[PDB]
């Protein structure tokens, strides 16, 4: 469904049938609520505990097809542009793509073959570095986030006497906002995520109805406006 | 009651158990027009009952109800407020409309006389068409007649437009006015005119005329304003 259909069925589901009908929502408000509902839905469906099914990214066909249009593959750029201080002397710093929402798969291609990057926790890092070896298992590499400015910088730890040729990252692209109409105005240009032009929902049509329902629920919680509704509907932001 | 009976029994009631016939004709014509309005509006009468609210009210307006067709106003190329509005002229002898229907290719559709507030409300929504068995109607630029815009759903053509309405009553005249009174007319007719209404409401028309006469002749401002309340 295109943006006009988002807005028309938003109006239908919000106030065109309600008995003591409420004021219609302005297009900026509808775009804001739709973008919020989109992000909430993405976060709810990525995490199993966030939805009533207990199903995350790839726990069912529907969850695969939900994020299928939001998956992207890119590469981390070696961060030798400027000097820096790494926590580990034997780690190579890489910069992830700017439009990164969530990392789901990483791999590094070295001279000793491809290796799956395992994101190790800080307590896990301490445990592993208290051991005599201090290097990954055969077909794996280690990873920790380092000092990041304006984009995520990442330290890749591989086994000794190994060089990294490329660093691929299969991630979830940051969703683009849903903007119903050109938000340009003479009184001031308002933006949802830095863009005023019309922006279609760049995800699969399977969850457009879900985004619409969530947006309507958020609109009605805003209309109710007491602390109660804000608190319970803020639980699903996550 | 014949007009002679109206004139004779006006004298019985007004002249203390026994006015010009023009003055009697004027008051009787005014009285019936009051009575039709008062018994049409439920709040205008003493029972709180309108046109179809009781058997008596149905026989009251029985001989005024008329069914006529609207004629397309294609002769005059005027300007309509709605894009898909077809201008139609209503019958000349029209007093109050009570049912309107339009026969389209899709089917007969009951016309809803839509208020100026509801139009702005229903035209601020996505679709902007009536429900599947209804049509809208709003009055438009009218010259010496009644013109109505029939806003039926797009993708449909209007083939017929039936109007069921209350006909304008004819005047009550008790004598040839031109015989003694030079060129006086009541509603454009100078000759004897009978009551075109059911005999059930002749007594109330006569009683109202007598009350109107006595209040008019008493001359008090309070009486004139008090009985002028029931003029609507």
UniProtKB/Swiss-Prot annotation, chain B:
Q: List the disulfide bonds.
A: none
Q: Which UniProt keywords apply?
A: Virion
* Cleavable signal peptide: none
Q: Does the keyword Thylakoid apply?
A: no
Q: Where in the cell is it found?
A: Virion
Q: What does this gene product do? A: Forms the tail multi-ring barrel with ring protein 1, ring protein 2 and ring protein 3.
Q: What is this protein called?
A: Ring protein 4/5
């Amino acid at each position: 469904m295109n943006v006009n259909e988002f807005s028309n069925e938003f109006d239908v589901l919000y106030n065109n049938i309600m008995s003591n009908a409420a004021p219609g929502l302005n297009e900026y408000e509808k775009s804001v609520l739709l973008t919020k509902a989109q992000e909430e839905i993405v976060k709810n469906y990525f995490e199993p505990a966030g939805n009533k099914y207990g199903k995350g990214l790839d726990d069912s066909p529907k969850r695969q097809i939900d994020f299928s249009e939001l998956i992207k593959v890119g590469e981390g750029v070696l961060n030798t542009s400027a000097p820096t201080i790494t926590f580990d002397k034997r780690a190579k710093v890489y910069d992830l793509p700017a439009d990164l929402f969530l990392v789901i798969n990483e791999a590094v291609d070295t001279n000793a073959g491809t290796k799956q990057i395992v994101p190790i926790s800080y307590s896990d890092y301490t445990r592993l570095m208290s051991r005599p070896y201090k290097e990954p298992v055969k077909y794996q590499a280690w990873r920790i986030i380092t000092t990041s400015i304006n984009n995520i910088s990442v330290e890749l730890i591989v086994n000794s006497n190994e060089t990294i040729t490329d660093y691929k990252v299969r991630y979830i692209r940051r969703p683009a906002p849903i903007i119903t109409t050109n938000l340009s105005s003479e009184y001031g240009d308002v933006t949802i995520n830095g863009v005023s032009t019309v922006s279609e929902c760049e995800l699969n049509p399977i969850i457009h109805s879900e985004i619409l329902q969530r947006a309507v629920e958020l609109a009605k919680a805003a209309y109710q406006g007491d602390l109660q509704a804000s608190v319970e509907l803020g639980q699903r932001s996550e």
